[PDB]
Amino acid sequence: SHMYYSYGNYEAFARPKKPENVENKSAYLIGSGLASLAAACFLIRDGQMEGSKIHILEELPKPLKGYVVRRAMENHFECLWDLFRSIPSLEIDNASVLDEFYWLNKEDPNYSRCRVIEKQGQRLVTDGDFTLTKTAIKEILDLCLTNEEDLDDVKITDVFSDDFFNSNFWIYWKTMFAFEPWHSAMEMRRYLMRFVHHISGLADFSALKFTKYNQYESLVLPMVEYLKSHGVQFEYDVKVEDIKIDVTTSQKIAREILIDRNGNAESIKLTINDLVFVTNGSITESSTYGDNDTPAPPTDELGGSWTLWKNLARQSPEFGNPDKFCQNIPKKSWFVSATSTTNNKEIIDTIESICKRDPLAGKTVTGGIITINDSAWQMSFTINRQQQFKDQPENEISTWIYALYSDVNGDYIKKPITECSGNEICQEWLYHLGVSTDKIEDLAKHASNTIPVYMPYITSYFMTRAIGDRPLVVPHQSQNLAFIGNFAETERDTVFTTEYSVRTAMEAVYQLLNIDRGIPEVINSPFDLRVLMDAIYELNDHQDLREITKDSKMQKLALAGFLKKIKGTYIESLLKEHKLL
Amino acid sequence: SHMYYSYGNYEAFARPKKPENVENKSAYLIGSGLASLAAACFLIRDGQMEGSKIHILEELPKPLKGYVVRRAMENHFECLWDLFRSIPSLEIDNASVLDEFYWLNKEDPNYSRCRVIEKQGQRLVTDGDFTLTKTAIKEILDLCLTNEEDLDDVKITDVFSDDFFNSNFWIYWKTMFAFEPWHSAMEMRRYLMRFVHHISGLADFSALKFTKYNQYESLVLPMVEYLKSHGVQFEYDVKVEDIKIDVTTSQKIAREILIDRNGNAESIKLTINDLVFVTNGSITESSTYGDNDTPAPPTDELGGSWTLWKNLARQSPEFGNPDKFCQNIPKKSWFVSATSTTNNKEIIDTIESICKRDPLAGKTVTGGIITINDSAWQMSFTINRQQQFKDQPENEISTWIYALYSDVNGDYIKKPITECSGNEICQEWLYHLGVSTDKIEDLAKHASNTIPVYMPYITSYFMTRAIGDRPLVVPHQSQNLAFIGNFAETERDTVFTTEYSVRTAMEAVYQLLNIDRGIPEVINSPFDLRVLMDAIYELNDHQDLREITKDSKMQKLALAGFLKKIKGTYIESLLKEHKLL
């Protein structure tokens, strides 16, 4: 391809030459999403493009009656870090967003003290172990051994059986990633191989890393200062309708950008030197907002994002199939998310007794999400390093809440979550905290300002896709078109991840300009001996190779002959090295 | 330990905090070798130490009747690149030594057009294939499967048999690395695992990378400008005798540095805050020099380096056993190296017709070493990107020559190489180039200025060592002592390598100061599925799994059952992925 993957320090520290003919090129970026911001940043640094020639078109210009909170990173987001190492931070002087992040998660590491709760406040008894049976472990192995071509339109409830589902591993997995039974077995197979190196840190969120303030403040805003420092243009109130593309038998050239600047109908014309970066699709689209007194109105609208993707699919199949992601989303699926802000010391005291940490402390609180396992909504909540907003009073905590089931009645508020307001969500949440039934309706109506948010497309990432549903970053024979974001296709990496946004960003800029530098490959942990032995030891709840085959005569007979061969050699020393012998 | 290994972009780009209490610390560096220069550089950048407090003691101050040339790098010298990414180059403005190196080897890649020659000029017939038989491949596998503890004082002629030795693979291996039959099987086992990822590029030197000018100009001098830019002290004509060390049952503290500054006998006293970095041993020690008319006088002296290592061994076994490296070196071993500089167009024309490239071109010439396979001295030569010296006339080429056998008579100059002058070496070399017997004595005596160099310790790196012969970088319970260089011990990495000098440099600075940053691990290619399948395909001269077992009924029967299991799964698709099915 116009590209090559690499995996070294040689490729990482090196600076690529200024790409040929970039002194006569312009680039247009569709949407102000985090992927576009990264693609524009890559055009500045590595592509050495002019700042006066990078245009970012957004529908938004410059209300809301409360605070709203919008997952964590991990060390091996290899493309996210090549970017923020070059982004000067907004807090600590002469140190990059990486540096401030790097130090902050070393000074205050992340770990969950109470990961799962049940029975209205109590800590889950088997919290820690995976409760994976011999059958469940095998279906995990078979799914990874299953080729990805043999997973077209294959749901998760077709690869696993009961043994896997009634386990803590499924509880830990579906809740930190927001997976659904009817979701793509193709993507979960990617997630299993993607994060096989932190599988020990799955039960306790030890391999997670959070920023200081919220995603806007710590990630988006440092980028925006970097971009405007270089003169990058920010077009506001620009809605993109369609993009005329010439798909000849030889090329694919973009020509027009049919926009609606505020109210006027205009159009930008593109040569072959005018690059276009389309963030096709959006999970944040068509989100409604409620308050502490009214539910967020449920909607199913097609926003300008999907209609933009739709208008390109009717121009070539190679530009993707949007309908598999935004149509036929089960009405049970995740739609509602909430944010309860409160200073009432009795709710913060209740949270303290569960998560074992002072929430009003500036340190870690929950360590991640805390899953109410027996809750009807299958609802989870998290509390990050308060205050999460830079100008929020230093005696308030902001709690993010979501639920995976949206058409079942709550155990206390006997109705679906799409029918509930802020205080009705706040009431069902507090009841599961163990708060007394007497102080439930008051502490939610008058003490906590809970904001519910309905997004009809939040699970569009994980829909059951097929080979060809997601478009390539740079389609075959394309000259100035690129698709970025989590509905673009690349190799092995996982969507619903800020890494995926910066991956397809860095792959789009590097291909269209042919930059003489390698792109960091998805970490090779799934092909690493040492990482895979660790997975077998951790999947079996810390059992050596003898204890795993002590009840199988057909297995313990094959192992005994295996140990005879590798006895006294590197393999046997590598097997005690990773606790397997 | 005081340390942790890491393998990511997260750890690579990040800057570590200023180590505690470094504002009251001093460091002393023993010798001006490349390892010390790196340790001092690491004290400046990562340790944030003062420049006025880094002392580099050297025996040399500020003749020689000719030019002298002193191996190549590879992409996965993970510690060498964390260093030069921060070293400003001396040629291209505002670009580091890494950058100028990175671009230079992309603009002009390296590859050997004629790797082995024989029969006085002709190209070897089987050049390319490994000629590894089924037995030879297995001894390779067994040696790696052999634990490293089971290799104490084990020579190379005890792990391999005849089948391995009469092969091109042995010819390619012993000559680019300067291995000997009687050398350590422990280190070759490390070399096999170290470079298992470039095994395809072993026959053609395609994975090699050279600098522009010589090692002094392109590596040492950029470092020295960086160090003196920060005020690092350079003590010249300082010979270090002994270093008094307090090895109590609890600690190991250095106290005195017994030196001989020029002629005076002085001594520096060390608190626990005065760090010491000892480059224990030296292959360059006690080197004599000849000219085009007289042989370099053979010597066996103990230089101030070995006597310094000796004086520390009589203070603790944990500081190493120097005698295994500098005593009992076989008199057949490599000692003589040469450098033939000439402008005579008939010698450069002869080289052109063999290496297939214009030597007087500024590009690649030989691509690496060219081995004269049937030569008595087992002599090899290389010609790098002339001119290799910054102020050398643009019509001269400088040819480096060495030989592995030093007590056998040459095929033309019927005497050992330790008896030969510059022109006698130049005559034996030209005879093997195919130059006519008539124009052999003239073109070497009057056309070429060949300088012979005798170093009695060049093969000290690869001597048959045992666990405990090489000291740890930071011995147990040590407080201010560190041993750097290729006679220090670390994990998995290989000596006789500029990576090893910068590895133990970066490990010494990071442990003594406890820097909050990981050290890049030796590349995990020997534990990488994809890299190991590639090795089996490349070791068998590009044969798939069917052709490797077509003559073994006990093997083809086990494979047929193996292919039944993994059929249609990831493993089988990964096996065509790497040409194995």
Numbering used by the authors:
A (entry chain A), B (entry chain A): -1 to 60, 71 to 78, 81 to 591
Task: Show sentences the authors wrote.
Flavin adenine dinucleotide (FAD)-dependent bacterial oleate hydratases (OhyAs) catalyze the addition of water to isolated fatty acid carbon–carbon double bonds. Staphylococcus aureus uses OhyA to counteract the host innate immune response by inactivating antimicrobial unsaturated fatty acids. In this study, we deduced the catalytic mechanism of OhyA from multiple structures of S. aureus OhyA in binary and ternary complexes with combinations of ligands along with biochemical analyses of relevant mutants. We conclude that OhyA accelerates acid-catalyzed alkene hydration by positioning the fatty acid double bond to attack the active site hydronium ion, followed by the addition of water to the transient carbocation intermediate.
Glu82 in the active site Loop (RGGREM) is critical for activity, and we mutated this residue to slow catalysis and capture complexes that were not obtained with the wild-type enzyme. The substrate-free state shows Arg81 is the gatekeeper that controls fatty acid entrance to the active site. The specific activity of OhyA(Y201F) was ∼10-fold lower than OhyA, and OhyA(E82A) was a >100-fold less active. The importance of Glu82 in creating the hydronium ion is evidenced from the severely compromised catalytic activity of OhyA(E82A). It is instructive that OhyA(E82A) activity is not zero illustrating that positioning of the buried water by the α7 dipole and the arrival of the protonated substrate carboxyl at the active site also contribute to catalysis.
